[PDB]
Design a protein around this ligand. Structure first.
Ligand code: ZN
Lengths: 108, 4
């Protein structure tokens, strides 16, 4: 009966990812970053996610992860901005950078 | 807003 196993959208409960899918990018699953509007984000990297909607075409501008292009990842249900999808890199080719405090962690 |  684990209580930490899955991540849901904090705003609506949409199923998004699992603890098992945490990815230590550059040796840490957590990355503390800011965007050009100076917003600070505690980003958890996941190899896999579901229930998102990826919007727009990938951009390399201001990428926090060298060699990766990002798209905005919204909650596919409620439209909450949950993070970004990263692609175009190597090892891994793709992953998700999700904003920790926008997810709720709990049992399956 | 939502830029990475
Ligand atoms: Zn949602």
């Amino acid at each position: 009966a684990p209580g930490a196993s899955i991540f849901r959208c904090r705003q609506c409960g949409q199923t998004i990812s699992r603890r098992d899918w945490l990815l230590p990018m550059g040796g840490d699953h957590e990355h503390v970053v800011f965007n050009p509007a100076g917003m600070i984000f505690r980003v958890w990297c996941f190899s896999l996610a579901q229930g998102l909607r990826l919007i727009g075409a990938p951009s390399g501008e201001f990428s926090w992860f060298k060699g990766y292009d990002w798209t905005i990842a919204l909650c596919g249900q409620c439209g909450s901005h949950l993070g970004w999808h990263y692609e175009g890199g190597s090892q891994p080719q793709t992953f998700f950078g999700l904003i920790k405090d926008r997810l709720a962690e709990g049992p399956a | 807003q939502m830029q990475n």
